[PDB]
Amino acid sequence: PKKKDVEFLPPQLPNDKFK
């Protein structure tokens, strides 16, 4: 029993490149 959902958000690659 690892997960009972559908996940795509955890990656969430940030930008932190505001000019």
Partner 1 sequence: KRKEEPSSIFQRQRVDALLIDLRQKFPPRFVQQKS
Partner 2 sequence: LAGAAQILLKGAERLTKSVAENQENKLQRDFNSELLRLRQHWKLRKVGDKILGDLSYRSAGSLFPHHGTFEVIKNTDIDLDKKIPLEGSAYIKVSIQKQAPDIGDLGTVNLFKRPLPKSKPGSPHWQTKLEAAQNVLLCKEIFAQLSREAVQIKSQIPHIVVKNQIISQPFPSLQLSISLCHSSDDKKAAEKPGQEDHLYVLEHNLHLLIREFHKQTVMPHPASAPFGHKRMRLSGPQAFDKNEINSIQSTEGLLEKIIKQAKHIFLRSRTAATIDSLA
Q: Which residues bind partner 2 (CB under 8 A)?
A: 16-19
Q: Which is nearer to partner 2, 3 or 19 (CB)?
A: 19
DSSP at 14? -
- The answer to whether residue 1 forms part of the interface with partner 1 (CB under 8 A) is yes
Token readout for 6 is: 């559908």
Question: Least distance (Å) from partner 1 to the CB of residue 13?
Answer: 5
Query: What is the rounded distance in angstroms from the CA atom of residue 15 to the CA atom of residue 1?
Result: 33
Give the start-end residues of each E strand in 1-19. Answer: none
The contact set with partner 1 (CB under 8 A) reads 1-2, 8, 11, 13-17
